[PDB]
Design a protein around this ligand. Structure first.
Ligand SMILES: [Cl-]
Ligand SMILES: [Mg+2]
Ligand SMILES: [Mg+2]
Ligand code: NA
Length: 326
DNA sequence: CGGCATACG
DNA sequence: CGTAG
DNA sequence: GCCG
């Protein structure tokens, strides 16, 4: 088992679901406390289990696996022995975990804001609704739409959204293309937002495109919330039988020269991208982001025509999106 | 021990 | 500070 | 919390 998540296939569904879920609770709690290193280790250990070819049934099977030391191994041992891990259950039940989870799920609210509200005594969404003057316009939107944004998006919904985005993009710039990215591109049947990447085959033509796209979607009455720019974090009106619901949609524009890098980054998973960028820098001495891949010694950027190019540049076996579910 | 990804709005 | 993967 |  290789130590980096980008060196191994990780399917969406796997053989150690309960164990991985438990480790991800501890990772999430670590993030709520600002412990980014512990969050990363628990996330990585969880991801190792997702990559295994069969269920872990005994503690012995963890020996030699990367990112399993005394703490993560103890969690797995308790789950194997008793079906529950007392540490995990205490987190789940805790008022701090539950409230930080609720608050950070609000669009516009991060860990820092959630933690401040927690220390001020706030615990519920209606607590926040009762002092709306201390809310940003983005938080106001997130709170008004919170209930809809909590219900998953289906692949049917995505197809309908992609058609309306394509219509707007086509008027904004004929020839521009719309690619579904994010979790749906990794094979998810549901998601909590939809991600699209927009480019144009003629380099430079995409400059200034996103404002034109957003104006057209807004004129069509489809935009419930949004803020020169190249990423737009929107709330869209999605038709439903006899009504509609709010859906988070991210729109991103990239020049075609950067499109493989942007496609790679926006397809995720988050852990996969962090691991790929860590691998690039620490093992290959190259600097990776969603715009390109830089050689800091020759001071040159790699050209890529495909994601396959990027994996080859980094000396990694190619993984399709469905195997990037780290 | 230091390191832990790297952007944009 | 928020957002993204 | 774990790795190198
Ligand atoms: Cl930490
Ligand atoms: Mg997404
Ligand atoms: Mg998104
Ligand atoms: Na949030």
């Amino acid at each position: 088992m290789p130590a980096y998540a980008c060196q191994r296939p990780t399917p969406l569904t796997h053989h150690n679901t309960g164990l991985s879920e438990a480790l991800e609770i501890l990772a999430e709690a670590a993030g709520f406390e600002g412990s980014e290193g512990r969050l990363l280790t628990f996330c990585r250990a969880a991801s190792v289990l997702k990559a295994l070819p069969s269920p872990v049934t005994t503690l012995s099977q963890l020996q030699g696996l990367p990112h399993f030391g005394e703490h993560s191994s103890r969690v797995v041992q308790e789950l194997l022995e008793h079906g529950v891990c007392e540490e995990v259950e205490r987190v789940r039940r805790s008022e701090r975990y539950q409230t930080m989870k609720l608050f950070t799920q609000i669009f516009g609210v991060g860990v820092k804001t959630a933690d401040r509200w927690y220390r001020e005594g706030l615990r519920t969404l209606d607590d926040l609704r009762e002092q709306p003057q201390k809310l940003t316009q983005q938080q106001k939107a997130g709170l008004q739409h919170h209930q809809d944004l909590s219900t998953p998006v289906l692949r049917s919904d995505v197809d309908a959204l992609q058609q309306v985005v394509e219509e707007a993009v086509g008027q904004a710039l004929p020839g521009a293309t719309v690619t579904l990215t994010g979790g749906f591109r990794r094979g998810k049947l549901q998601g909590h937002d939809v991600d699209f990447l927009i480019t144009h085959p003629k380099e430079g033509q995409e400059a200034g495109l996103l404002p034109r796209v957003m104006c057209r979607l807004q004129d069509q009455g489809l935009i419930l919330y949004h803020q020169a720019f190249e990423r737009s974090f929107c709330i869209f009106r999605l038709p439903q039988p006899g009504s509609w619901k709010a859906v988070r949609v991210d729109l991103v524009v990239a020049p075609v020269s950067q499109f493989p890098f942007a496609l790679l980054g926006w397809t995720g998973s988050k852990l996969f991208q962090r691991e790929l960028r860590r691998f690039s820098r620490k093992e290959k001495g190259l600097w990776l982001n969603s715009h390109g891949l830089f050689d800091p010694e020759q001071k040159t950027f790699f050209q890529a025509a495909s994601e396959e190019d990027i994996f080859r540049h980094l000396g990694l076996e190619y993984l399709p999106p469905e195997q990037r579910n780290a």
